[PDB]
């Protein structure tokens, strides 16, 4: 609630030269090196104590900020976030002082930042070669799990002739990292088409996206090979028919099609009329590869079908465009304003900053600029991010003596 209110009362800027932003970047060094600071922002050097509750170096005076290695610490978006997310620190502190037994409490932002309260150095990816900080909060299970409602994907790989070579390496990596953004409440099945559609794996319907099924789908996807002419109509018939199969267990929600193609000149208007007429099924289309084929039909299926269109032209574009599809799916959850602010607890997982088995309670945070002076609401359909407060399993085991 504080984050929503504070963001609603933040005015955009581009001038952070004299009106700086001061913050502690979790991936700094302990050495008093003023060459560790930044043009647009000024860095806190904190006094770290050692705690046994966390097992690390804590400092309850401010909240650390983690910014992915791909994202510049001083772009305009990040500096605006580093500004308006500084009231979160005093709310963090008052939360802790009410209950001293509280673990990490983090705001994971849609800009990639994570601001977590008990300020600790980033675990193992601050500064050491041969280990790269691949963390990105917008992919963490609690974030994926608070940023949308459960899915029913069907991933339509395009294994035809034209995707052989690099595009196929990128398609199988993209589909691996698309399956990686799936919970146990989400159902998935990978289908592939070239002049006729077929499953890549043994599953003939939407199966649950748990560790074992996801491994089977990944190991099938990595075995896939490119050959033959493309048929979008016969592949989309398969996709739409597998999302109408209600005899199986399903997350009867958010039906999606993730079309991983490169490009053609087929729009399949008739099959989108016959199968997705009232537009219950979204269609996200990905244009993988460094190529030159036409992208008009691909950019058009997404528009026609409530989807979105992403271009994945190289590795290193793989990791962002998936969490982007989640960026899209959260519109209906935003629009139903306060029926969607229910705290949800994640499956047990291992904490990024090492504390072992922790479930985590999440709550999406909405964008509230134009309210009671109703305005255009350009991007008032996205979430700012997800709040998440951890609970340790050792903490629950103490209530079961």
């Amino acid at each position: 609630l504080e984050a929503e209110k504070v963001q609603a009362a933040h005015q955009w800027r581009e001038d952070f030269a004299s009106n700086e932003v001061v913050y502690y970047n979790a991936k700094d060094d302990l050495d008093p090196e003023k060459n560790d600071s930044e043009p647009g922002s000024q860095r806190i050097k904190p006094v770290f104590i050692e705690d046994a509750n966390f097992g690390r170096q804590i400092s309850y005076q401010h909240a650390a900020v983690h910014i992915p290695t791909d994202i510049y610490e001083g772009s305009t978006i990040v500096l605006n976030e580093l500004n308006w997310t500084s009231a979160l620190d005093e709310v963090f502190k008052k939360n802790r002082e009410e209950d001293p037994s509280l673990l990490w409490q983090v705001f994971g932002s849609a800009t990639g930042l994570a601001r977590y309260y008990p300020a600790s150095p980033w675990v193992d990816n601050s500064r050491t070669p041969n280990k790269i900080d691949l963390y990105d909060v917008r992919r963490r299970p609690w974030y994926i799990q608070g940023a949308a409602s459960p899915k029913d994907m069907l991933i339509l790989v395009d294994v035809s002739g034209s995707v052989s070579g690099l595009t196929l390496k990128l398609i199988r990596t993209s589909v691996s990292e698309m399956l990686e953004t799936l919970s146990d409440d989400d159902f998935v099945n990978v289908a592939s088409f070239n002049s006729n559609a077929q499953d890549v794996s043994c599953f003939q319907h939407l199966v649950q996206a748990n560790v074992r099924n996801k491994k089977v789908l990944k190991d099938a996807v990595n075995n896939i090979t490119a050959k033959g002419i493309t048929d979008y109509k016969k592949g989309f018939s398969f996709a739409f028919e597998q999302l109408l199969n209600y005899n199986v267990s399903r997350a009867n929600c958010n039906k999606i099609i993730m079309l991983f193609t490169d490009g053609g000149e087929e729009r399949a208007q008739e099959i989108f009329n016959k199968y997705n007429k009232d537009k219950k099924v979204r269609v996200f289309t990905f244009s993988v590869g460094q190529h030159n084929y036409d992208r008009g039909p691909i950019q058009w299926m997404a528009c026609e079908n409530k989807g979105y269109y992403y271009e994945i032209p190289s590795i290193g574009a793989i990791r962002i465009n998936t969490q982007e599809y989640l960026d899209v799916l959260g519109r209906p959850m935003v629009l139903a304003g306060d029926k969607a602010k229910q705290v949800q607890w994640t499956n047990v997982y291992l904490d990024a900053l090492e504390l072992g088995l922790v479930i985590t309670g999440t709550l999406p945070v909405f964008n509230i600029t134009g309210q009671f002076e109703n305005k255009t609401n350009l991007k008032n359909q996205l979430i700012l991010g997800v709040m998440g407060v951890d609970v340790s399993l050792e903490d629950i085991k103490r209530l079961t003596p």
Partner: peptide, 19 residues
């Protein structure tokens, strides 16, 4: 057993941001 409530398919949703 799956989650009780899930949000898709609001009519107010703004579809005009494909890319």
């Amino acid at each position: 057993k799956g989650p009780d409530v899930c949000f898709d398919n609001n009519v107010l949703e703004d579809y005009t941001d494909c890319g």
